[PDB]
Amino acid sequence: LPLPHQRLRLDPVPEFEELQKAGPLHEYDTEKQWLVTGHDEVRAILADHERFSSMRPVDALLPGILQAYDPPDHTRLRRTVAPAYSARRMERLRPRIEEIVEECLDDFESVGAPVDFVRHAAWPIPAYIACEFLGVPRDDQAELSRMIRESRESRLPRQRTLSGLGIVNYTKRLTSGKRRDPGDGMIGVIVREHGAEISDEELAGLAEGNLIMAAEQMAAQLAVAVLLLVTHPDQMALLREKPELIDSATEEVLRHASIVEAPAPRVALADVRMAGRDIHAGDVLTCSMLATNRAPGDRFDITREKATHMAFGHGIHHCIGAPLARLQLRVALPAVVGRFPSLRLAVPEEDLRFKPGRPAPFAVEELPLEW
Ligand code: HEM
Incomplete structure (x- = not known):
């Protein structure tokens, strides 16, 4: 596990904080490699798509996966897909999100004495929301959500592969269904508005990618947000x-x-001078988001004034689901602290297990909660 993905519970490790002190750019192999820790340097790399490519370095096509596209084709695909994420489309989802939150919190609460928040709320909430966002029939949602989690989390590689093929097959069908009948959800919106500008394979790959990311990223984000709130009960009461x-x-x-501890590795397309270093064409750069977002001595503080974080990245690849992610948190967090004023850990903090942020996301495996 590379230094930029090591944690002590929620915190970067002291050896990583120490390397950050030395400068913004280090000769370090995460995957000639550079590890980028400087705030301005990370910004600069991510904003400079023309000199720093998001394509895997090779000496494999991913249709519809925006992260893997460089910005001739990235530009056309992104603007074909952007309308589905607009602030107006998002606000129209709000009612279903509130409904889903209440339903899942009702279910979480209905369980015995202590309850795992990951199993009963943190996974189900965003998984169901991702299905709605994609326009998945209500009756298929439980099935598909299980498949999503299992495809990303199963101890059994066979099972990840099986669940993964299941997702791919389901979204192909959903794509052709929505191509014929462009109704509710991201695929419908994209077909109605830019149907001519996008192939069935791009649309299907994009559907799968977005379904998996919306569910998985937010599951992790929601469980860690709640972990943070329950381990800071004053702030919970403030909110x-x-x-x-x-x-x-x-x-x-x-x-x-x-x-997300690091976005995709960036590949230099030209020689570049940065922060006193000679970056050569073909070098591979890892941007450390833990470096940029976190400082030694930082404490979790919900009243924090200015937010300069890069949790969603930066530049042309800046998280396109951000409006949806922020919306979920805006609904779910007040609902959680409102319904459960005495929410707290049911086990010692040291019992808690964390999935490392490589591959993304960093997550808490299990969150046994009380009251
Ligand atoms: C809080 C949860 C989330 C976090 C922290 C997060 C983080 C990120 C980051 C850092 C990137 C940039 C990757 C790069 O530059 O290589 C990104 C891109 C992306 N994310 Fe999110 N994400 C989250 C939730 C979501 C959701 C809910 C969706 C689906 C609606 C989504 C879909 C995407 C897509 C399609 C891209 C690629 C956009 C592009 O490359 O132009 N993510 N995300």
Whole structure:
């Protein structure tokens, strides 16, 4: 496990904080490699798509996967897909999101004495929301959500592969279904508005990618946000009493959690001079989001003033689902602290297990909660 993906519970490790002190750019192999830790340097790399490519370095096509596209084709695909994420489309989803939150919290609560928050809320909430976002029939949602989790998390590689083929097959069918009948959800919107500008294979790959990312990223984000709130009970009470704190609170949980520890490796397409270093064409750069988002001595503080974090990245690849992610947190967090004023850990903090942020996201495996 490379240094930029090591944690002590939620925190970067002291040896990584020490390397950050030495400078913004290090000769370090995460995957000639560079590890980028400087705030301005990370910004600069991510904004400079023309000199720093997102394509895997080779000496494999991923149709519809925006992260893997460089910005001739990235530009056309992104603007074909962007309308599905607009602020207006998002606000129209709000009612189903509130409904889903309440339903899943009802189910979580209905379980015996202590309950795992990951199993009963943190996975189900975003998984169901991702299905709605994609326009998945209500009756298929439980099935598909299980498949999503299992495809990303199963101890059994056979099972990940099986669940993964199941997802691919389901979204191909959903894609052709929505191509014929462009109704509710991301695929319908994209077909109605840019149907001519996109192939069935791009649309299907994009559907799968977005389904998996929306469910998985937010599951991790939601469970860590709640972990943070229950281990800081004062702040939980602040948010309950000052509900107008939700916006800076959602920024703080994104900043502090740093769910994506590093975006895709960037490949230099030209020689570049940066922070006193000679980057050569073909060098591979890892941007450390833990470096940029976290500082030694930082404490979780929902009243935090300015948010300069890069939890969603930066530049042309800046997380396109951000509006949906922020919306979920804005609904789910006030609902959680409102319904459960005495929410707390049911086990010692040292019992908690964390999935490392390589591959993304960093997550808490299990969150036994009380009251
Ligand atoms: C809080 C949860 C999330 C976090 C922290 C997060 C983080 C990120 C980051 C850091 C990137 C940039 C990757 C890169 O530059 O290589 C990204 C891109 C992307 N994300 Fe998110 N994400 C989250 C949730 C979501 C959701 C809910 C969706 C689906 C609606 C989504 C879909 C995407 C897509 C399609 C891209 C690629 C956009 C592009 O490359 O132009 N993510 N995400």
